[PDB]
Each structure stands twice: as structure tokens, then as C-alpha cells.
Write a protein that binds this ligand. Structure first.
Ligand SMILES: [Ca+2]
Ligand SMILES: [Zn+2]
Ligand SMILES: [Zn+2]
Ligand SMILES: [Zn+2]
Ligand SMILES: [Zn+2]
Ligand SMILES: [Zn+2]
Length: 391
């Protein structure tokens, strides 16, 4: 027997215990005799009522994973640094206000989850975690993040969402292996120019911040695939945004954009462009160069017209133009052979181009709240028999 769910049973046969699972057992205290389980590799203490840990936890020299999530931990003992084989430390949902400097001794640590605690600082000794690949600090009380974070050469994922960050340290740009950066729901008013140094960054979550502009250096993110900028205060995009050749998803929902740079057409790999809730008055002709675009959301903008180049979007499957002020659709709309959904609700369309009959793959057409004559729509229903027309 190597798997145990009971500490009393585990203590009768020590040197055999490899996994000790005590999750959801209303455990109020971990007995000091835990140190006797010399061959323990995984200790699961999740979903319990632990307020502290015994100093003897440091004796678990073979421990590779320590799961301590969803407890009421007020502090970690200095002896936590003695866990020289520890690769994963999970402490999400606790009441930690500090992390001991001895955390820097955990030279084998690959993953550290400190999300949902009450941390405002980290010891500078965090810079010694040169094997750390994943660091979660979301839902804490960081008003600022120490520049020593930028020293984590092997870091691939950094979670800093739901903190109180106004600014990022310029040293963040030294995370050359970073692939995912989570900054949702902070109060970021600006991004450092050094953000562009994150050459391996694939995913950047910046939703629900207070950004007004993006630095020109944002274009240096050569590996970026997903850029989530929902619910910020962007009034413009830098022309350098067009240098993001690997970008697949650009989410700009609920910003204050009035125009798009012509360089938007350079986004070779863009599949999804969400501009819902902006204040666009026009689209550049360059929009037609987005040959991989599948989804285009333009709801609640102020568009009066669409460029004829919209018809060049050969891979477009979904087009949302709800609640704009469109007076007409270009005849080129008929070239959208892959289009399946077209939402034209709440516009001022008094007519539709005859070329709409060429949309053989259209499945759903939303026309409610347009001054369209009923005879014209009845005729379109017979021209697109496979389409459901909501009018
Ligand atoms: Ca990876
Ligand atoms: Zn995120
Ligand atoms: Zn949030
Ligand atoms: Zn909308
Ligand atoms: Zn309205
Ligand atoms: Zn209605």
C-alpha cells in the first residue's frame, strides 16, 4: 500500500506512503508526525481548515507536490524552504499576508500558486527561483509588483490579475521566456515600452484596466497570438499593431475607438476581430487584406457605411453589424461565400443589394429594426431558401 487517505493508517506503515490524500476531511491541524513519512511524494491538504503548518513539514525531503489550497493558512513556517525536491506548491485561497524569504531555497520549484491570498509584497529572494515556470499571484493586494520578478529567466506564465496595479516595472521586459501574461482587472493606465521585449509572449490578458493608448513597442511582440483589451479606454491603436504577424485574436470590446490604423490590414493571421461597443465612424479599405478573418464583431459602433473591400474577406463566417447606422450595404457583400451569420439589426437599411442572393451558405440573417419593405424581404426569402431570415 502506497496510497493513503488516513494519517493514522499512514503512520502504522511509514516508509511505504508515497501519496497522502487528506483533502476535504475538516482537518484543523496537521500533526508533527507528518515528518516521519520520509518517502512521501505528494501531500494533498486541499479544502480543509488549516491555520498553520508544523515545522516538521520541512523533513519531507522526497515531497514533490504540496497541495494546500482552500484552507485558512495565516503563515508558512521558515522550514518550508527545506523541501528541496518540491516542484509544485499550491496555496490558492488562503489568508497569507507574507511569504518567508526561505522560499528562495526551493531551487526545484516549477509552479507556485499564491492566488486568492492577502499578499502585498514578495521577498526579493524570489529572484533565486530560476527553475520557476509558472507563478500565480492573482486576487491578492499588490499595488505594485517588485522588479525582481523580471529576474525569473525560466518563467513562462505569470498571473497578476485582480490586484491593484497602476503600473508595471520596466524590468518585466526581461522575462524572455514568458508565454502568458495575465493582467486582467487591475488599474493599469499605461504599459511600459519594455513590454515589446517579451519575444516569446503568445497570450496577453489586459481586460478591464484603464489603458488609453498602447505603446508603439507593442508591435515588437512577434509571437503574440491573442491580445485581449476588452473594457479599457483606448481611443486609438498604434500603427505598429500591424507588425503582429502571428496575431489570431484581437479583442477590443467596449473601448472608445473612433478609427483603425490602415496598418490593421497587415495582420496576416488574424481570425477574430472584436470591435463591439466602440465609436467607429469608418473602416479602412485595408480591412479587406485580412484574408484569414473568420469573425468580425462591429456591434454598436457608429458606422454609416462599409468599404467595398469588405467583400475581400473570403474566410469570413460571422459578421455582426448590429445597432450601427448603416444606410446601405456594398454590392461586394455577395463575394462573402463562407458567410453563415449576418446581423444587420438596428440599422437604416431601406434596401439590400441584389448580390445578397449569392450568399448560398448564409444560415441566419437578422434584419429587425430596418426600414425594409416587406415585399423585398419576401422575395429575398425565396432567393435564399436555406437561410432563416429574422424580420
Ligand atoms: Ca510552455
Ligand atoms: Zn487571464
Ligand atoms: Zn475581474
Ligand atoms: Zn454588442
Ligand atoms: Zn438604439
Ligand atoms: Zn423588437
Amino acid at each position: 500500500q502506497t496510497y493513503y487517505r488516513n494519517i493514522t493508517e499512514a503512520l502504522k506503515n511509514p516508509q511505504n506512503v508515497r501519496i497522502l490524500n487528506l483533502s476535504g476531511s475538516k482537518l484543523t491541524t496537521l500533526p508533527g508526525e507528518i515528518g516521519k513519512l520520509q518517502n512521501l511524494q505528494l501531500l494533498n491538504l486541499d479544502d480543509n481548515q488549516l491555520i498553520a503548518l508544523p515545522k516538521e513539514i520541512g523533513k519531507l525531503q522526497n515531497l514533490q507536490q504540496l497541495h494546500l489550497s482552500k484552507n485558512q493558512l495565516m503563515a508558512l513556517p521558515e522550514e518550508i524552504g527545506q523541501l528541496q525536491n518540491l516542484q509544485k506548491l499550491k496555496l490558492y485561497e488562503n489568508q497569507l499576508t507574507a511569504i518567508p524569504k526561505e522560499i528562495g531555497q526551493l531551487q526545484n520549484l516549477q509552479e507556485l500558486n499564491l492566488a486568492h491570498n492577502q499578499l502585498a509584497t514578495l521577498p526579493e529572494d524570489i529572484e533565486q527561483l530560476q527553475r520557476l515556470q509558472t507563478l500565480y499571484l492573482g486576487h491578492n493586494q499588490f499595488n505594485s509588483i517588485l522588479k525582481e520578478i523580471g529576474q525569473l529567466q525560466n518563467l513562462e506564465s505569470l498571473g497578476l490579475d485582480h490586484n491593484q496595479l497602476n503600473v508595471l516595472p520596466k524590468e518585466i521586459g526581461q522575462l524572455r521566456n514568458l508565454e502568458s501574461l495575465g493582467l486582467d482587472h487591475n488599474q493599469l493606465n499605461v504599459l511600459p515600452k519594455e513590454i515589446g521585449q517579451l519575444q516569446n509572449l503568445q497570450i496577453l490578458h489586459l481586460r478591464n484596466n484603464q489603458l488609453t493608448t498602447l505603446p508603439k513597442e507593442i508591435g515588437q511582440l512577434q509571437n503574440l497570438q491573442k491580445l485581449l483589451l476588452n473594457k479599457n479606454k483606448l481611443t486609438t491603436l498604434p500603427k505598429e499593431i500591424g507588425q503582429l504577424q502571428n496575431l489570431q485574436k484581437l479583442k477590443l470590446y467596449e473601448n472608445q475607438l473612433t478609427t483603425l490604423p490602415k496598418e490593421i490590414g497587415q495582420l496576416q493571421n488574424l481570425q477574430e476581430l472584436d470591435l463591439d461597443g466602440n465609436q467607429l465612424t469608418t473602416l479602412p479599405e485595408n480591412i479587406g487584406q485580412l484574408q484569414r478573418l473568420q469573425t468580425l464583431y462591429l456591434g454598436n459602433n457608429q458606422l454609416n457605411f462599409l468599404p467595398k473591400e469588405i467583400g475581400q474577406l473570403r474566410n469570413l463566417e460571422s459578421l455582426d453589424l448590429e445597432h450601427n447606422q448603416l444606410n446601405a450595404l456594398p454590392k461586394e457583400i455577395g463575394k462573402l461565400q463562407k458567410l453563415q451569420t449576418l446581423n444587420l439589426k438596428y440599422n437604416q437599411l431601406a434596401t439590400l443589394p441584389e448580390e445578397i442572393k449569392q450568399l448560398k451558405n448564409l444560415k441566419k440573417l437578422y434584419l429587425h429594426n430596418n426600414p425594409l419593405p416587406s415585399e423585398k424581404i419576401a422575395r429575398i426569402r425565396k432567393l435564399l431558401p436555406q437561410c432563416i431570415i429574422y424580420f
